[PDB]
Design an enzyme around this catalytic site. Structure first.
Site, PDB file in Angstrom:
ATOM      1  CG  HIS A  89     146.069  32.697  33.546  1.00  0.00           C
ATOM      2  ND1 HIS A  89     145.057  33.473  34.294  1.00  0.00           N
ATOM      3  CD2 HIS A  89     145.826  31.457  33.430  1.00  0.00           C
ATOM      4  CE1 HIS A  89     144.393  32.431  34.822  1.00  0.00           C
ATOM      5  NE2 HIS A  89     144.671  31.494  34.472  1.00  0.00           N
ATOM      6  CG  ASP A  92     149.924  45.454  31.967  1.00  0.00           C
ATOM      7  OD1 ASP A  92     151.010  46.279  32.300  1.00  0.00           O
ATOM      8  OD2 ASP A  92     148.534  46.055  31.678  1.00  0.00           O
ATOM      9  CG  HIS A  94     151.046  49.173  35.879  1.00  0.00           C
ATOM     10  ND1 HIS A  94     150.178  49.582  36.911  1.00  0.00           N
ATOM     11  CD2 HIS A  94     150.361  48.412  35.226  1.00  0.00           C
ATOM     12  CE1 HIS A  94     149.159  49.337  36.554  1.00  0.00           C
ATOM     13  NE2 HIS A  94     149.175  48.469  35.459  1.00  0.00           N
ATOM     14  CG  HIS A 129     147.281  43.855  36.254  1.00  0.00           C
ATOM     15  ND1 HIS A 129     146.439  43.830  34.898  1.00  0.00           N
ATOM     16  CD2 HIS A 129     147.692  45.255  36.313  1.00  0.00           C
ATOM     17  CE1 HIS A 129     146.613  44.979  34.347  1.00  0.00           C
ATOM     18  NE2 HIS A 129     147.060  46.034  35.234  1.00  0.00           N
ATOM     19  CB  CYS A 130     146.559  38.185  34.803  1.00  0.00           C
ATOM     20  SG  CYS A 130     145.938  37.117  33.594  1.00  0.00           S
ATOM     21  CG  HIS A 139     142.047  36.725  34.529  1.00  0.00           C
ATOM     22  ND1 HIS A 139     142.900  35.793  34.036  1.00  0.00           N
ATOM     23  CD2 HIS A 139     140.803  36.431  33.838  1.00  0.00           C
ATOM     24  CE1 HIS A 139     142.065  34.907  33.490  1.00  0.00           C
ATOM     25  NE2 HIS A 139     140.914  35.259  33.268  1.00  0.00           N
ATOM     26  CG  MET A 144     146.808  36.270  37.986  1.00  0.00           C
ATOM     27  SD  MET A 144     146.041  35.132  36.426  1.00  0.00           S
ATOM     28  CE  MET A 144     147.463  34.553  36.184  1.00  0.00           C
ATOM     29  CG  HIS A 249     146.557  55.295  59.417  1.00  0.00           C
ATOM     30  ND1 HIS A 249     146.664  56.851  59.603  1.00  0.00           N
ATOM     31  CD2 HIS A 249     146.772  54.865  60.880  1.00  0.00           C
ATOM     32  CE1 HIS A 249     146.978  57.094  60.861  1.00  0.00           C
ATOM     33  NE2 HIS A 249     147.301  56.201  61.569  1.00  0.00           N
ATOM     34  CD  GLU A 273     146.351  62.498  59.473  1.00  0.00           C
ATOM     35  OE1 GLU A 273     145.837  62.104  60.559  1.00  0.00           O
ATOM     36  OE2 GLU A 273     146.352  63.653  59.104  1.00  0.00           O
ATOM     37  CB  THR A 274     146.043  58.404  56.069  1.00  0.00           C
ATOM     38  OG1 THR A 274     145.946  58.345  57.387  1.00  0.00           O
ATOM     39  CG2 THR A 274     145.376  57.645  55.210  1.00  0.00           C
ATOM     40  CG  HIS A 300     142.277  55.617  58.432  1.00  0.00           C
ATOM     41  ND1 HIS A 300     141.121  56.191  59.099  1.00  0.00           N
ATOM     42  CD2 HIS A 300     143.210  55.506  59.895  1.00  0.00           C
ATOM     43  CE1 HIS A 300     141.347  56.613  60.259  1.00  0.00           C
ATOM     44  NE2 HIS A 300     142.516  56.119  60.930  1.00  0.00           N
TER      45      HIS A 300
END
Ligand SMILES: [Cu+2]
Ligand SMILES: [Cu+2]
Ligand SMILES: [Cu+2]
Ligand SMILES: [Cu+2]
Ligand SMILES: [Cu+2]
Ligand SMILES: [Cu+2]
EC number: 1.7.2.1
Lengths: 334, 334, 334
Positions: A89, A92, A94, A129-130, A139, A144, A249, A273-274, A300
């Site tokens: 494993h 990363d 972001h 995330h892996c 993964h 993960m 939502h 709303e969304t 939604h």
């Protein structure tokens, strides 16, 4: 800078949807913020039918915990892969710059650990995330992934530059799973990970999730584990999806201020709303509750929400406002 | 406030894509705006092949009508479920606050009616849809959704704060249908709603629409029912999708000002070719026509548009501008 | 205006991901910018397995070349369909106004050519694509699409109005292919285009791409064809998707300034991890590299990236910044 001259602060993480202690407005100068996570491969039951998968987790949960720092802090993560696991494993971020977000520097076989440091130079919520070369989506879609929030040093701001201060925060991680199916449509029963790999790949290539869940399972954010608030409370909901688009939502509410793609140097979108959180992104929505009762919080695509699992609840306490909404004539025959 | 002291105004709805009468800039103080809709379950032919479904409608149409009010008006809806229907229905307004948007207060069995009131506290275009607990996506994806527009009291504004005034408005509701298929790929022929329910659920869980249509059927906004405009007219197109993302595009034009996620306290995005309206959202695009002729208006997944149904037309009258576009050399051999 | 009084400049196009010569800030008044493209139907091998399709191209490449002009220039395109092709083609520019973006004026049978002119009245990056009536998605999803960039006359600007100047530009065209499959899952082997058409239609109606690639093939932007930069260089990556949503992400970096839906009169979104480019749109992201090494550039549906093809690489030269990221303790047992 000699980083060794900076304060160190150790964070003790909590299980989602809760979030570890932090201060919105930075009460110190930049710090090295120390985190530890232990990778755990474990079986998880993900639906009401009892379907059990082999999940790959940071710290035992899907999603992994929310990490919180301020802009221009350093994140220093000790990542532990115990010898009770079987796979390689890494991680990363972001939020980070360089080396594939850290993945190129954090490859740990079972029985290994590593410590990565990076400067959190951009404010926002971000996925982590892996991502092991050659088996990345397996993964991620085994659970993960998590998120990190890098707050501005002076906290959050609205579209006019005035402060926004939350009273409560929750972290909703949304996970698309691709459980392999036989031709009749039942989930395959893998009498090892290697033996699973090709049909995991086949299942992913359909691009059709079998399950889309919050906090790791159908119904996880309901019942005794519903999210809570009171009328008048300001709530920030951080929502991540490491692999696939979602459209959150709040049923019965709104996103009063939404950073749909999660980055706080941008003004928020008002009155949503969304919102669309693209796969590979974290977003954040701020809302002040105005009515008590049950709310659903959903993706939604309502099939994804109510058939595949992407729905949780809030239970909100307080007084009902009949100006804002009322039943003038309750349902009746006449 | 004693709501009984406010003016009442009764709205008489029209069938989409047309929109009932309103004034962009509010000519009165806040009002109680009274609407009535009658639910109708009915058969609808949705494609050129003659495929007939059992649709679930507000007011007889897919989508349901566009309702228009101003910010801080009250919407008072009488919702009627006649005894000629067979199912339980309700209504959730994304414009409203509390009680699952109204759904928790508006459950009507066949033979029942109810009246809901809510304060329209946020300006924008918003989805409304039926949402009966435990069968939400089935009702929505059977056509039981529409939209409401809550205008700012001083009308629409551009990114600089100056007025934007439309000459014409249209409401395009986009519907994803999931008609159940047999193993050979033909739509199943349900010799009741209960007998349909499980395969409706199966079909929805594929996440693959069989049809994606504007105004309830393939080709509905074409021919004698094409949308119309003249060169120089300012047109607002409200577009909703209650369940699935769409990406509208005016072929041969633009969205000069677009609120992709529909909420008017935000500045519009300028000069869009194509916008993303997330599932569960209404958006609005303003355009001033500059050339006559036929335009297509599509979801720009062009498979969805031209194979599955998500395409309509404008016929635009007026003079052609050769400065703006011309054929210098018409197609020829040479 | 008498267009014949304006300067003419002839552009010589280059193959993606490279971009022909231009000046960010316009060094002349408005011009007629002359382009020529020759349509080529050709076989292309698109994956590591050797799968060969019949592609439909502008200028021999998937995507077609990036065209660059300034706002209120005229684009004058000579479009050639040689008699060695077998199909009818045309071109629709999303940058243009009228006649279905040009498609209604540019229908060329094999052995024909045409010249279209349009005024580029809106700044941004825009898709262009073939669109023959009745067979639109087949041509687009056979590779027949590219993009055009219409720069503001004073170049790009940040969210505060100050200049943004790129040192390098690349054009990443992302293509969804729908290679027909038999019931066992193998790509069909069409012992003509007409004989292919119905199963091309069937394959598209699944809405599930078989391949999603950058620059026309799996791995095209890797190895000797990786994108390049140096630490400190400002890079603009234009990304288009003519048919389907994508979510670009620079693994190990960010989009410092992103016009996700591509239109430069809008302020960019800052500090993006991942952006949503809707199908039918071009977007643009500006980044200043801060670390050397390998980066991946992906669609962050990681299944789409790493299983279906939507991944390329940058190789970046220069000094490593240990303040920004470092391995404090390299992976080890202990
Ligand atoms: Cu892993
Ligand atoms: Cu990632
Ligand atoms: Cu209903
Ligand atoms: Cu809803
Ligand atoms: Cu073509
Ligand atoms: Cu197009």
């Amino acid at each position: 800078v000699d980083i060794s001259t900076l304060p160190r602060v150790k964070v003790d993480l909590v299980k989602p949807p809760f979030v570890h202690a932090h201060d919105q407005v930075a009460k110190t100068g930049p710090r090295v913020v120390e985190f530890t996570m232990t990778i755990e491969e474990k079986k998880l039951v993900i639906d009401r039918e009892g379907t059990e998968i082999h999940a790959m987790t940071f710290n035992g949960s899907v999603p992994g915990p929310l990490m919180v720092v301020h802009e221009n802090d350093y994140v220093e993560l000790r990542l532990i892969n115990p010898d009770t696991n079987t796979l390689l494993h890494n991680i990363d971020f972001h939020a980070a710059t360089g080396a594939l977000g850290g993945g190129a520097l954090t490859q740990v076989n079972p029985g290994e650990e590593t410590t990565l440091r990076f400067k959190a130079t951009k404010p926002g919520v971000f996925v982590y995330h892996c991502a092991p070369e050659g088996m990345v989506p397996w993964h991620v879609t085994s659970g993960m992934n998590g998120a990190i929030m890098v707050l501005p040093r002076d906290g959050l701001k609205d579209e006019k530059g005035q402060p926004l201060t939350y009273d409560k925060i929750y972290y909703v991680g949304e996970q698309d799973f691709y459980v392999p199916k036989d031709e009749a449509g039942n989930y395959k029963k893998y009498e090892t990970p290697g033996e699973a790999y090709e049909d995991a790949v086949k299942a992913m290539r359909t691009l059709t999730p079998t399950h889309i869940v919050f906090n790791g399972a159908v119904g996880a954010l309901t019942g005794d584990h519903a999210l809570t608030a009171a009328v008048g409370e300001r709530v920030l909901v951080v929502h991540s999806q490491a692999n696939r688009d979602t459209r959150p939502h709040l049923i019965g509410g709104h996103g009063d201020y939404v950073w749909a793609t999660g980055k706080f140097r941008n003004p928020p979108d008002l009155d949503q709303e969304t919102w669309l959180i693209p796969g590979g992104t974290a977003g954040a929505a701020f809302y002040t509750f105005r009515q008590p009762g049950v709310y659903a919080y959903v993706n939604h695509n309502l099939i994804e929400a109510f058939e595949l699992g992407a729905a949780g609840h809030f239970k909100v306490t307080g007084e009902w406002n009949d100006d804002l909404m009322t039943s003038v004539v309750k349902p009746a025959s006449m």
